[model samples]
Structures are given as structure tokens and as C-alpha cells.
Target: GSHMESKSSSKKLKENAKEEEGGEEEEEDEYVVEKVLKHRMARKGGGYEYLLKWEGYDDPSDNTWSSEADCSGCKQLIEAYWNEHGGRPEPS
Candidate 1:
């Protein structure tokens, strides 16, 4: 607040800003599953395909089917879902 310190303040501002913006590579494209709408057996893969709606993906028609292995990272959610509603639907 005095007669303004020389380039010391200005110099540090640039470096601090740089580090704050591009500090580390800890961040990546990690998208979390918002919810599982349904489960179905694959037609070709014979495996299971889970209907997933991503957390941050904002869309009404955001329908995507990912395999079980593909959703390995989401085992917690998937397992939780299985416990909730993952039985062979009765076709009557």
C-alpha cells in the first residue's frame, strides 16, 4: 500500500499465476457415472451392457451403453446397482 514495491510484487504475481494454472498433471478426463438406467444382455458381445448417464454430461437424450469391463472403474456404483435391481426381468 506504500510507494509500491519494485518489480518484486509484479514478478511473483506472474509465477504464482503460472503455477496455479498449470501446476500438475493430477487432472484428467475422469467422468463418473451419474446413474444406471437399465441393464441388458448384449446381442453380439454376449456380455452385459449397462445403460449409463454420466454425472457432468448435461443432456436429455444422453443414452450410452457401456460394457461391464469398460465400467471397471465404476464397480462401486455398478455393484451397488446390481444389489438394487439386477435380476433377470420376468418376461410374462
Candidate 2:
């Protein structure tokens, strides 16, 4: 589960912000409480917006947007949940 470990992992640390919420979105700004991987932040027209990153472990160094983009598609969160409190009998 190393690939899905939380940012707290020795190999993985919060490279950017701390564990909190509510912040202005920027082109290059990284939101740690949001994305567990490299990604870009987009400000929506409304007061809120989504912090998006590519899905799955491909290129950790790259933040290239895919044709299909969605924050809910993140798999890292699933692993993080399991690592933290052992949720779900097993991961698919």
C-alpha cells in the first residue's frame, strides 16, 4: 500500500500546505488537504472550486491534465482512508 499511503508516510510528506481548508486557487498552487499527488488548482466562478490532479500513479512529477478530469476519481484518498483507520474489508 506504499503507493497509496498518506502524505504522512516517510517517503511522502506534505510538499505544500498543511492539513486545513479554504484557500484561494492559483494556477500552480498545491492544496495538500485536497490532492495527495501533484496537480493544479482551478478557481470556479462560484465561491468554491475543485483542486484537481491526475488519477492514479503514473508520473508523480507531472501534472498534465487528461481528457477526462474529475476530483472524485482520486484513488489516493481510498488508500489514505484504509491506512489511517483500516476502513473497508478489502480494496478492489
Candidate 3:
């Protein structure tokens, strides 16, 4: 019975370690977009994509182009881009 208890405790520790590793990975994958720097409507599809600059990341290469549907909560950013640019440019 003592040996069985030791085995169970070891199993629980391994499970807890796996859970902690998964939590760390999830945290690392979480990215925060600081602001919408620019936007342009997609030429191929009937939607838009915005230039999202992430917080804590200053590299231009780190910026991502996210689709309008994926960024529905940021409609104000799209509208603001159009307001400043006058209109969506023709697809080149």
C-alpha cells in the first residue's frame, strides 16, 4: 500500500508538470496588438486587412496583416484609415 501511494504521488507530480509547461506555452503565444498602423482592402477577397503593430515588438517584420473578419472589433480603425487616406486604393 505504501508503494502504491508513492506511485500515485509521482504520477500526480508528472501531470502537474505537464500542465505547467502547457500554461507557459499558452502565455508565450498570447500577443497584444498595441495599435492599428495602416489598412488596405484585399484585392482578391471581398474584405480588408489591417497592419497590426504588436506591443513589446518594435520590428516592422513583427507587424501582421489581419483580415477584417478576424478584426471585426476594430472597425473604428478601418474607418479611421479611410478617413485619413480618403478612400481605399485600387488593387495593384
Candidate 4:
């Protein structure tokens, strides 16, 4: 045979130390909440839920019904929604 060889894409997980330790790559940024559209007092979890408008999203409703835990970094947006749209529905 004249030649026989194999090749790979050379992709490697080298220096993965920055996995979750604040890598400088902007592509790994956390999703930003553009605005809080609405609020609802959850019936089962006994926690608050906020409708979120994602920043620069194109689809009509790429938003989310965010749970209380999801707002650790976005309380200001929650306050703004309560201010304009009124408070969350009374808990039962």
C-alpha cells in the first residue's frame, strides 16, 4: 500500500482549570434578564415566580417563568415589576 493514515480534529480539554472559576471568555457569560414582565405566587412551591424577558432575544416569547432561586443576581428587575404592575397575588 502507498499510504495509510488517520487524523483527528485536535480538539482537547487542555487547561480546564477555568471551567467555573470566572473565565475571561465573554461567551460563557450568564444570561441577562432584560425585564420582569409579571409576578405570580406559586401554589405548590410557596415561592415567587417572575416572567422574564431575555436581553436581545428574537423569538416572541423566549422568556421564562423564573423561580425564586433564579433571582439571586436579579432582584432589581423584580422590584421594578412590582412597582408598576402591583404586587404578587396573595398566597392562599
TM-score of each: 0.46, 0.21, 0.46, 0.49
Can you write out model 2's per-residue Cα lDDT over 7-89, one digit (the tens) per residue? 66357566786686687956975344334343233444323123334344344545444222343465564345435665566
lDDT score, residue 34, model 4?
A: 88
Off by over 4 Å in 4: 1-30, 58-62, 86-92
Clashing pairs in 1: none
How many steric clashes does model 1 contain? 0
Best by lDDT: 4
Error of 3 at 43 (Å): 1.3
Q: Rate the local accuracy (lDDT) of all candidates.
A: 0.69, 0.44, 0.69, 0.73
lDDT of 3 by residue, 4-84 (tens): 534343333344443333333334588776667766778997887788767877757446788887577776666666668
Q: Provide the lDDT at 22 for model 4.
A: 59
Candidate 1 residues 1-92, lDDT tens each?
A: 58865755333344444334455567687986787766778888668777777887754544777787856866666666777865653468
lDDT of each residue in 44-92, candidate 4, tens digit only: 9679887888777633444578898767857888777776767775479
For candidate 4, which ten residues in a row score worst on lDDT?
16-25
Show model 2 residue runs off by greater than 4 Å: 1-27, 30-72
**Whole-structure CA lDDT of model 2:** 0.44
